[PDB]
Amino acid sequence: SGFRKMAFPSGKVEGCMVQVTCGTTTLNGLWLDDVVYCPRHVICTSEDMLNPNYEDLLIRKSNHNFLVQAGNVQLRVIGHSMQNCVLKLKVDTANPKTPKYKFVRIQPGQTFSVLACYNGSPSGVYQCAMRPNFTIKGSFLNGSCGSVGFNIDYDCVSFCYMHHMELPTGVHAGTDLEGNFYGPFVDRQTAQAAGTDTTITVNVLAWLYAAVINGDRWFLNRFTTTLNDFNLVAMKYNYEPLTQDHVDILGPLSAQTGIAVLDMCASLKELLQNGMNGRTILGSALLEDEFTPFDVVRQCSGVT
Amino acid sequence: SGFRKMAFPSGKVEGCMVQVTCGTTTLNGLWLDDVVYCPRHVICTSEDMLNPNYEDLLIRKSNHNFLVQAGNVQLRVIGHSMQNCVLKLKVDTANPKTPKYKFVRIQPGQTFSVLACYNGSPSGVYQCAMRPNFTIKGSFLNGSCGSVGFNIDYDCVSFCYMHHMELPTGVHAGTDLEGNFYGPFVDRQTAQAAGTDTTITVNVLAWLYAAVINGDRWFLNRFTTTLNDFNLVAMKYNYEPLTQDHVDILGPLSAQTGIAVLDMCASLKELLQNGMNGRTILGSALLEDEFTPFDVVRQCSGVT
Numbered sequence: 001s002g003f004r005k006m007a008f009p010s011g012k013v014e015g016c017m018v019q020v021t022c023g024t025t026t027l028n029g030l031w032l033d034d035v036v037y038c039p040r041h042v043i044c045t046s047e048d049m050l051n052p053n054y055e056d057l058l059i060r061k062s063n064h065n066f067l068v069q070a071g072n073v074q075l076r077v078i079g080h081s082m083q084n085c086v087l088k089l090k091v092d093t094a095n096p097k098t099p100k101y102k103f104v105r106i107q108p109g110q111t112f113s114v115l116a117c118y119n120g121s122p123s124g125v126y127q128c129a130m131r132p133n134f135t136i137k138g139s140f141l142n143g144s145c146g147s148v149g150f151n152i153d154y155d156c157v158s159f160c161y162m163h164h165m166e167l168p169t170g171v172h173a174g175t176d177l178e179g180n181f182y183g184p185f186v187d188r189q190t191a192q193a194a195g196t197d198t199t200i201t202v203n204v205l206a207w208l209y210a211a212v213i214n215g216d217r218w219f220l221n222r223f224t225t226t227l228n229d230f231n232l233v234a235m236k237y238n239y240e241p242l243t244q245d246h247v248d249i250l251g252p253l254s255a256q257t258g259i260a261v262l263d264m265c266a267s268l269k270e271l272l273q274n275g276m277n278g279r280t281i282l283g284s285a286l287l288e289d290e291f292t293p294f295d296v297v298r299q300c301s302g303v304t
Numbered sequence: 305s306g307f308r309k310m311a312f313p314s315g316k317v318e319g320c321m322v323q324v325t326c327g328t329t330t331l332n333g334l335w336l337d338d339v340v341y342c343p344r345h346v347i348c349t350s351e352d353m354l355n356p357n358y359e360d361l362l363i364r365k366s367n368h369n370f371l372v373q374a375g376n377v378q379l380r381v382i383g384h385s386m387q388n389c390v391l392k393l394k395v396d397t398a399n400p401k402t403p404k405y406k407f408v409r410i411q412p413g414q415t416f417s418v419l420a421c422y423n424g425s426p427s428g429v430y431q432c433a434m435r436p437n438f439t440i441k442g443s444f445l446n447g448s449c450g451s452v453g454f455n456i457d458y459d460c461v462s463f464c465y466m467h468h469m470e471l472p473t474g475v476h477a478g479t480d481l482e483g484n485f486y487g488p489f490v491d492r493q494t495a496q497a498a499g500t501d502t503t504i505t506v507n508v509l510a511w512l513y514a515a516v517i518n519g520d521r522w523f524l525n526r527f528t529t530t531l532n533d534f535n536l537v538a539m540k541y542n543y544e545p546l547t548q549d550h551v552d553i554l555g556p557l558s559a560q561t562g563i564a565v566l567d568m569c570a571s572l573k574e575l576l577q578n579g580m581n582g583r584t585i586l587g588s589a590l591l592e593d594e595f596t597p598f599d600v601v602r603q604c605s606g607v608t
């Protein structure tokens with residue numbers, strides 16, 4: 001027992017990290033097969049970032065301007081192209097450490113692990129959620145661009161995120177591996193509104209189920225609610241409205257614990273309306289929304 | 305910016321994980337050079353665990369009884385020996401993936417990453433602290449024994465923990481890599497007192513410094529305190545007494561922020577006496593003690 005904010009083992013992704021330099025800028029790249037993916041802003045100077053014309057800036061660059069180094073070894077760049085906000089650098093050598101992989105576009109509310117990197121070197125790994133407003137609250141400093149987010153299903157790495165930007169608010173924005181930003185963001189040093197964010201209701205319920213499985217049960221009560229009544233409270237507290245699709249995804253946890261989803265909703269309603277009263281749930285003094293129902297099942301069953 | 309409970313990249317450790325089976329019991333082993341380390345209780349049945357005579361149980365076992373499998377490949381065991389609560393199985397092949405490594409015994413209050421494993425396969429990675437009472441609050445299910453804790457200094461992996469047991473209270477106990485338990489614990493299915501635990505004061509202060517660096521400053525006040533006065537409050541709230549050695553280790557953070565350590569102690573004093581008033585610090589509604597001053601500096605500087 002015990003419940004932790006667990007990340008996937010990062011080994012398969014560490015083997016793909018490279019450093020990419022163009023002019024004065026250095027960031028991280030992801031080397032899969034004979035292609036290195038990286039943020040297209042590697043071609044910008046600080047003069048350019050206020051309003052970059054990426055097509056024009058890329059035209060000034062040749063294959064030999066992109067310096068790609070896999071730890072100690074230099075890769076030979078034989079092609080380059082921009083797809084949305086990413087650059088794809090074709091190299092003459094397939095990465096011998098390429099794992100089985102997919103590129104996926106995750107949905108808001110889903111979770112993933114991030115391998116934070118600097119100069120193509122891995123520094124740390126952490127788990128996070130894609131916020132409903134398509135930002136992530138990460139830990140990224142200058143030079144971390146190109147660090148990636150991913151999930152692992154046995155031996156397959158599904159890459160879902162590449163880091164591009166820190167908004168003036170200190171929250172993070174990035175793209176899928178085809179270079180499409182999550183949310184309304186553009187890769188320009190301009191003030192950009194991240195929409196109103198909400199709490200991921202289905203994940204808070206999943207985490208309350210993880211709390212019950214792991215012995216924290218003080219918040220269970222004698223009440224029940226309906227989706228309609230619960231959603232009036234979710235509205236007041238800036239929580240995502242719960243749907244039957246969310247109830248269905250919580251089915252395994254409801255079956256394992258014997259606590260009907262609407263009964264857990266009534267515990268969540270009382271916690272929203274009353275607070276914790278100075279108590280904790282799984283070592284947290286707030287309602288945690290960074291574990292999906294799949295994460296709770298995976299962690300409570302020991303999936304490798 | 306941003307601050308996360310970050311674990312070390314687990315790749316170097318994933319390459320060392322193996323499965324060890326003896327009789328009916330399967331757990332994880334750590335393969336470094338030509339030795340596989342694992343909990344000695346791999347030789348017990350459930351009948352034995354209430355009061356095992358490990359010397360007698362090991363005498364019934366031969367090299368060929370220890371089945372060691374590195375993913376798909378079987379290792380040939382040419383020797384076995386018990387050192388404290390670990391078994392060392394000499395194999396005929398050095399692990400080709402052995403990183404530069406050390407065995408270290410960490411101090412209470414220090415942090416490390418755990419690579420939770422099942423059947424020799426890595427499932428997830430998380431960061432945690434060794435509690436002042438020598439327990440860890442991990443996420444471990446049956447079959448996770450033999451999973452290890454570690455720190456990484458550039459290319460050197462310092463292994464500090466091997467998981468052995470879950471106490472009836474749901475907290476975790478284990479050993480250094482020479483098989484010595486941290487704390488008073490013994491590898492026997494018996495009720496065992498974990499001492500009174502305390503909050504790691506120096507880590508809470510380090511985390512308050514991380515909060516200031518990352519823009520969360522609401523808790524800063526117009527007060528100061530002394531070590532003596534602060535320690536009267538630490539005593540009341542079950543916090544470790546702060547020493548000049550702790551103040552010295554916070555020197556880099558005090559220098560970076562310009563906030564004298566005793567001034568940060570006065571902010572901590574007010575937070576202990578007043579609570580958070582429904583506010584958060586770095587996304588937490590409680591005072592976090594799982595980041596050391598070294599962790600905060602490492603995360604705020606981008607160490608790879």
Ligand SMILES: C=C(C(=O)Nc1ccccc1)c1cccnc1
Pocket residue numbers: 041049140141142143144145164165166167186187188189190305
């Ligand atoms: C330098 C960063 C950045 O935001 N670049 C950028 C700025 C605007 C548009 C595109 C790229 C940065 C700093 C900290 C964390 N992550 C990223």
Ligand SMILES: C=C(C(=O)Nc1ccccc1)c1cccnc1
Pocket residue numbers: 001345353444445446447448449468469470471490491492493494
């Ligand atoms: C089976 C476990 C265990 O505690 N074994 C053990 C029990 C007593 C002494 C030695 C070994 C276990 C379960 C969950 C998490 N971690 C470990």
